Every structure is written in structure tokens, then in C-alpha cells.
């Protein structure tokens, strides 16, 4: 009956907890207590990208590590030339409430989405000189929080309907759906593209197999909503920022939480997380108007980016690791080295 | 210094800047409103009778109207989950939140008060005023006059309540309905004035289904909100 099913679920959860606990051979902090600290990373702003009318929620670096796409709640995506600050493209949006943007790996497409529950793919390289809406993907029953491109024809999206979805582009239909008991806020794609991890408003991050379509693993530990998520460049680890003012690094193989990054002087939630190219530096944007650069192996705050007069909403590190670009609610993007 | 193609790219960026300035001239002069309420609340009727006078799973509905040559954009939410904690953060810069409450339903009035308390005390709406539309006043009047259900059965503080002296009863309407509607308004305003300091203010309004003045009250309240924002910004207080 229902009681029997509940008891079986409780027993399985206890078994999973015991199995995870029976593998804590040596904590990551204890092992890395011997490695040298990275020291104070005095990152400095080099270019200020301005021209957004309102606050920015999403930014994405191109594969070329030179072209940016930034989504602001003025109904606009802007494709920036990071090197020259020139505005390559200005795409008006038919829905002003945008929470995510994605720049296609090929550079041919950009993605946007928000409270209109539609993932809009815009074609950049057309015979006509204008950027045109390649198509609109509908089917989510909640706000679209993150979208990412597997390729020019597949896109994975996360919504507030406690659901992620992998979409085909030529046929705008959900190729598969991924079913979390709260709003899903962030997505991150593994470098192999065969998996993706999604954090939701239930203090739970789930690693999903893209092809099969079922939840491969689940990770708990946070005390509040998960707002940002990213992969370690290895593809076998991922870091989550949350409203409980903590970041947490998990490993899929260990199937348990590895390490936590927190300080008593910060009480604001993390809104955007990213990794440096090596994975040694974990950059996390906060509501305290700052972007804290942590040492991913020592949990020591190694740097602070303080150039924004409003909350840091989006943050991203280039493919080559040269620069880190963070966009805030003060209508500005800042590029740091 | 710059190659010819580089200068032409700079020129393209300058034209993009010019278009962005033209769009800023419109964004600055356009006021964004967030419509909130419940299924019982006639916010759909307000939207209909305010769009007339001035996609299946789509989560946002934008109603654009204009009063005294100033533009307003209400944004109703219609395809999102019962949770509100996150997408509400998208509206930290809106001019006002229009909160529509069905004053007739005594059973769900406490739910409306709790929802208004959640909106008022939210961290990201600490500087955002609420235009409170106590809709369905005619139904409340009919219910109180033809008295079968009593507020005292739901709020055990209606007996020890008197109509405030600073009241503006409509012509030819009984003191009982005035007492009821001002009690509801006083519950909402008590929640409003319990906290928030002076950053944001709740504007109460007794509205009906077919009222044609709702756009006018939104315009007046938004004018007051922008006045307060300018008093703060231009260093007058």
C-alpha cells in the first residue's frame, strides 16, 4: 500500500545515505591542506560594456572567447565584441522578461527565454543582414531559467515547472523531458555533452543522462534554493550556488558532496557560479554587489571583484580562460583579467 | 590605429548606440506594472475592461494602455506554478504592484491577506509600492445588505471595530457596508504599515467590476510613486 511504498522509499534513502557515508575516506580539504594557496588574485576590470537600458540577467561567452551575448530586461540581447567593446549585434526581444541566454557553440545561433515560457532561438548568420527569430520553442508550463545548446539543432532548457527538456530545433518539439519538486533555476552541460546537471528550488541538484532521459543521480546538502550550477572542466564534478550564502562542490563519481565554500561575513545568496579554465578558481556572483573568487580546493576566498553598484546576476569565463565577464543589475558588463 | 573594417565596425556600433538611445527614451517614459491577485479576484475583468477602453502555455500577458499621454504596461502571470519566490525577483524595478483582492469572499480573505503580506515583506520589493484594488465592492455590498454570512464568523475583531473618522463613504450607501469594506481595508493597511519604513507605500482603492476609473487611479498612484522616488533621488529628503 501507500505506507509500504513510503517505508520502502525511506529504507532506500537510508541505504543511499549509508553508502555515501561509507566512502568518506579522506575529506578534500584535508587532502588539499598540503597544496599551496593561490594567493590574492587581484583581478582588474579592463573593459566596461555599457548600453543596456535595464538590469542584466544572463551572459554567455562564445567559443571564440571574443563575442558576448547579454540579456537585459529591456527586451534586448546585445552581442558585444569583448576585445573592442564594439556592439556587433542588438536583438530586440518580443518578451522583455528574459532570465537566460545561450550562445551557440557554432556561433550561428543565440538563445533567449524568460517569463514568456518560450525558448527563442535567433539566427545570427543569415543572407539578410538582420538577426531573425529562427524559431520559438513552447511546451514549458513555467518560467524558463536556463537554456544551453548541445549543437545547432538540439537545446536543453530548464523551467519553473519543475522540469527540464531537450528540444529538437528543426522540429520544435520536446525530444525528451526530465522530471525535481521545485523551480529549476540553472543548467550546466558536461564537456562531453552526454550529461547535464540541473539545480532546483529544492536544495537538490540532479545529474541527467541526455540520451536516455532519466535522472542518473541526485545530490542534496543545501538548505535553500539552488540558483547557479556549473561543471568542473573535468566533467566529473559540479559546483552549486544557493540562497543559503554557500557554494558546494559535488562529484558525480563519489555521488556525495565534496566541499563547501562559505564565510560568516557573507550572508547573501549566490546568483551565478563559474569555473576558471583549470578549475582552481571558482567564481561566484553574490547579492552583496561582488563576485567572489574562491580557491576550489582550499575554500579560501582568494579574490573579490568589486565594480558593480548593483547585484551581480551573470558571470562567465571564456573558453581560453583569458578573461572573466560579469554582468550586474547596474546595466553593465565588466571584463576582468 | 584602426583598419578600415575596424572603423566601419565602430560606425556600426555607434548606430547601435543611437538606436539604443532612442529605445531608452521610450523605456524611461514607459511605466511597468505587475498585476497580482487570485482566481476569485477579478483581475482578468480589470485587464479586459482596461484594454478595451484604452500562446497556450504563455506565462506572461502584457496589457499596454495609456493615460494622459503616458504609457503603462501591466504584466499578468498566467502560466506559472503556485510558487512565486523566484520570478518575483524579475519585478524589483517596476513602478507598482497592483494587488487585486476579492473583498466579498470572507472564506479566502485570510489567504489574500497572507499573500499580500508575502508581497509586502519580500526582500526584492522593499522599494515598490502596491496599488491595492479591493475589487467586487458591489458583491460585498449585496452580501452585507442581504445578510446571511457575517464577517464576525471569520474575523473575531469586527465586533470591536468602528468606522474610522477619516472615511469617505459613497453617497447613499449604508454604514454597515462602509464598516465592512473599511475593516477589510484596515486589515490590509495594518499589514502594510506594520513594517517597510517609508520606502514604499500601499495605495488602497475600492474598485468594482465595471469601473472605468481604474486606469486613472493607477496613473495617480504611479505619479505619486515617481514623485517620491524623485524626492529621494534629487536630494529633497
Amino acid at each position: 500500500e501507500l505506507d509500504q511504498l513510503r517505508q520502502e522509499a525511506e529504507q532506500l534513502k537510508n541505504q543511499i545515505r549509508d553508502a555515501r557515508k561509507a566512502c568518506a575516506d579522506a575529506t578534500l580539504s584535508q587532502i588539499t591542506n598540503n597544496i599551496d594557496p593561490v594567493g590574492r588574485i587581484q583581478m582588474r576590470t579592463r573593459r566596461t560594456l555599457r548600453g543596456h537600458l535595464a538590469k542584466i540577467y544572463a551572459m554567455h561567452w562564445g567559443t571564440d572567447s571574443r563575442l558576448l551575448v547579454s540579456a537585459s530586461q529591456d527586451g534586448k540581447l546585445i552581442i558585444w565584441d569583448s576585445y573592442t567593446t564594439n556592439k556587433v549585434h542588438a536583438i530586440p526581444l518580443r518578451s522583455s522578461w528574459v532570465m537566460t541566454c545561450a550562445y551557440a557553440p557554432s556561433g550561428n545561433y543565440v538563445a533567449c527565454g524568460g517569463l514568456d515560457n518560450i525558448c527563442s532561438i535567433y539566427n545570427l548568420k543569415t543572407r539578410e543582414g538582420n538577426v531573425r527569430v529562427s524559431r520559438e520553442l513552447a511546451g514549458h508550463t513555467g518560467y524558463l531559467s536556463c537554456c544551453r545548446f548541445l549543437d545547432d539543432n538540439q537545446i536543453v532548457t530548464s523551467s519553473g515547472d519543475t522540469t527540464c527538456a531537450l528540444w529538437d530545433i528543426e522540429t520544435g518539439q520536446q525530444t525528451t523531458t526530465f522530471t525535481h519538486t521545485g523551480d529549476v533555476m540553472s543548467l550546466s552541460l558536461a564537456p562531453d555533452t552526454r550529461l547535464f546537471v540541473s539545480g532546483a528550488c529544492d536544495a537538490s541538484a540532479k545529474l541527467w543522462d541526455v540520451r536516455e532521459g532519466m535522472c542518473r543521480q541526485t545530490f542534496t546538502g543545501h538548505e535553500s534554493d539552488i540558483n547557479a550550477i556549473c561543471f568542473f572542466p573535468n566533467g566529473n564534478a559540479f559546483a552549486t550556488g544557493s540562497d543559503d550564502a554557500t557554494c558546494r562542490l559535488f562529484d558525480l563519481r563519489a555521488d556525495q558532496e565534496l566541499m563547501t565554500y562559505s564565510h560568516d561575513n557573507i550572508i547573501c545568496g549566490i546568483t551565478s557560479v563559474s569555473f576558471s579554465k583549470s578549475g582552481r578558481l571558482l567564481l561566484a556572483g553574490y547579492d552583496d554587489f561582488n563576485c567572489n573568487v574562491w580557491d576550489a580546493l582550499k575554500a579560501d576566498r582568494a579574490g573579490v571583484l568589486a565594480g558593480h553598484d548593483n547585484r551581480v546576476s551573470c558571470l562567465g569565463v571564456t573558453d581560453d580562460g583569458m578573461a572573466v565577464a560579469t554582468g550586474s543589475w547596474d546595466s553593465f558588463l565588466k571584463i576582468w583579467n | 590605429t584602426l583598419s578600415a573594417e575596424d572603423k566601419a565596425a565602430v560606425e556600426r556600433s555607434k548606430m547601435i548606440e543611437k538606436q539604443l538611445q532612442k529605445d531608452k527614451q521610450v523605456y524611461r517614459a514607459t511605466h511597468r506594472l505587475l498585476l497580482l491577485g487570485a482566481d476569485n479576484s477579478g483581475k482578468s475583468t480589470i485587464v479586459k475592461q482596461m484594454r478595451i477602453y484604452h500562446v497556450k502555455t504563455s506565462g506572461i500577458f502584457e496589457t499596454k494602455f495609456q493615460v494622459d499621454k503616458v504609457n503603462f504596461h501591466m504584466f499578468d502571470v498566467g502560466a506559472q506554478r503556485d510558487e512565486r519566490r523566484k520570478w518575483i525577483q524579475c519585478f524589483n524595478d517596476v513602478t507598482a504592484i497592483i494587488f487585486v483582492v476579492d473583498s466579498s469572499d470572507y472564506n479566502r480573505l485570510q489567504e489574500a491577506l497572507n499573500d499580500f503580506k508575502s508581497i509586502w515583506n519580500n526582500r526584492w520589493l522593499r522599494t515598490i509600492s502596491v496599488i491595492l484594488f479591493l475589487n467586487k465592492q458591489d458583491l460585498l455590498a449585496e452580501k452585507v445588505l442581504a445578510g446571511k454570512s457575517k464577517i464576525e464568523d471569520y474575523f473575531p475583531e469586527f465586533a470591536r471595530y468602528t468606522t474610522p473618522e477619516d472615511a469617505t463613504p459613497e453617497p447613499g450607501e449604508d454604514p454597515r457596508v462602509t464598516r465592512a469594506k473599511y475593516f477589510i481595508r484596515d486589515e490590509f493597511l495594518r499589514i502594510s504599515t506594520a513594517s517597510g519604513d517609508g520606502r514604499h507605500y500601499c495605495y488602497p482603492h475600492f474598485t468594482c467590476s465595471v469601473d472605468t476609473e481604474n486606469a486613472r487611479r493607477i496613473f495617480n498612484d504611479c505619479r505619486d510613486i515617481i514623485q517620491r522616488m524623485h524626492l529621494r533621488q534629487y536630494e529633497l529628503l
Partner: single-chain antibody, 229 residues
Framework: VQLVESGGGLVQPGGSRKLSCSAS????????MHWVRQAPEKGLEWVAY????????YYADTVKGRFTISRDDPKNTLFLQMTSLRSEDTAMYYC??????????????WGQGTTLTVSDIVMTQATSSVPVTPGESVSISCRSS???????????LYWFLQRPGQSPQLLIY???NLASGVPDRFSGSGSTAFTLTISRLEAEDVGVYYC?????????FGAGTKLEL
């Protein structure tokens, strides 16, 4: 994308004539426009350029002052008004579409040309004719008087193919980048000295190959390398 041109013919020397260009099928307002002349048997020569927003207008030294360029974005029509016509101005005039942003392909689309008959970095193409047979691989070389590699890392060399009785078609922009719609057979490389390599040649690649610089105005072409079967 279509660029039709009109307004040419027989005109007595010393007169005037206006050339019009109707653009249909693309965002004309966001594209810069070029007028490029070609004498009846000689090569291509850049005449004028108008920028998006009409804020940057350049003329060749041989047409400056007596020619003026203009555009009408709402009507999507380019204009070249010419005064004091001379015997040198007997050519097919071409409208050229060129957008300028990072990664863009300038000179992507050429029009059809209008015949008008009246009654500076140097591009050298030391080879004017090449005997070729289908199936082989040929390389067309150009030389420049000044280095076209700018400090930004771009070598601003362009390649065009003019098939018999047809407008020039972009093949390679910036000396390495393939245009859209050209087969992967074409490939270009270089440094002051450049080359265009065609592999597994087909019968549709016969014509005259022109190399054009874009480092600084005036835009100067080469003589052209004719490939005949």
C-alpha cells in the same frame, strides 16, 4: 538577395547621368554599399563607397569631386550621380553589398552591372592567363605593395571570381575565410604575397580571378588571372 541596377547607356562626353540600384531581399539599411567599375576588357576598379547611416563616404581619386554617392534606405535604393563624364568612364558599374562587424563577409553579394559608354596599395597579378584542365589543382598568386596584415591580426585580402557574362562572386575574404555558398575546394593563404588554391577543379570555375585589398582606401584590385579550359 537581389541587387538590380539601372541608369546606363550612351551619353555624350561632358554630360551627366545618375545610376540607380534597387536592393530587394536583405536589410539594406544595415549594409554598406560600393560602386565598382570594370572597363569593357580591363579589370575591376573601385569607384565609391557609402556606409550604413551615410556617415562615411569615400570616392576614388579618379572620380572624386565630379561623382557623388547617396542612398535612400526607406526606398532601398542606391544612387551614384556622375558629372563631367570622360572617356575613362566607359565601364560596367556594379553595386556591391558589404557589412562590417566582427566575422562579417564584406563584398558578399554583387549586383548585375550597368553599361555606361561615352563617345594606393598596388595589387600585381604577374600571371594573366593560365591553361588549365578539369581535375587538376591550380594556384593563383597576387602580390601587394604594402603588407596587408594589420596589428589586429587580420590580413585584408579578398578574392573574387568573374565567370563569363556574370558578376564577380566572393570566394575568400581576409585571405583565409571561405564565403557562404562556395565549395570547400577553394582555399587561400599568404602573408605581401598571397595565393588562391583550387583543388579538384570543375568546369564552373573558369573565368577571371580578382584580388582586392581592403586595408585602406582606395580599394585597389588586381589585373585579374584568366583561367581558360
Amino acid at each position: 538577395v537581389q541587387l538590380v541596377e539601372s541608369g546606363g547607356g550612351l551619353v555624350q562626353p561632358g554630360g551627366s547621368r545618375k545610376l540607380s540600384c534597387s536592393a530587394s531581399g536583405f536589410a539594406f539599411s544595415s549594409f554598406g554599399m560600393h560602386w565598382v567599375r570594370q572597363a569593357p576588357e580591363k579589370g575591376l576598379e573601385w569607384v565609391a563607397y557609402i556606409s550604413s547611416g551615410s556617415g562615411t563616404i569615400y570616392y576614388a581619386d579618379t572620380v572624386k569631386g565630379r561623382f557623388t554617392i547617396s542612398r535612400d534606405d526607406p526606398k532601398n535604393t542606391l544612387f551614384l550621380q556622375m558629372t563631367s563624364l570622360r572617356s575613362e568612364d566607359t565601364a560596367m558599374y556594379y553595386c556591391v553589398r558589404s557589412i562590417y562587424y566582427y566575422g562579417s563577409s564584406p563584398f558578399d553579394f554583387w549586383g548585375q552591372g550597368t553599361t555606361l559608354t561615352v563617345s594606393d596599395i598596388v595589387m600585381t597579378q604577374a600571371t594573366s592567363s593560365v591553361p588549365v584542365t578539369p581535375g587538376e589543382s591550380v594556384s593563383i598568386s597576387c602580390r601587394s605593395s604594402k603588407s596587408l596584415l594589420h596589428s589586429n591580426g587580420n590580413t585584408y585580402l579578398y578574392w573574387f571570381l568573374q565567370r563569363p557574362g556574370q558578376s564577380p562572386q566572393l570566394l575568400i575574404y581576409r585571405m583565409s575565410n571561405l564565403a557562404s555558398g562556395v565549395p570547400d575546394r577553394f582555399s587561400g593563404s599568404g602573408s605581401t604575397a598571397f595565393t588562391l588554391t583550387i583543388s579538384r577543379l570543375e568546369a564552373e570555375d573558369v573565368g577571371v580571378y580578382y584580388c582586392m585589398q581592403h586595408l585602406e582606401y582606395p580599394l585597389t584590385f588586381g589585373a585579374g588571372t584568366k583561367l581558360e579550359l
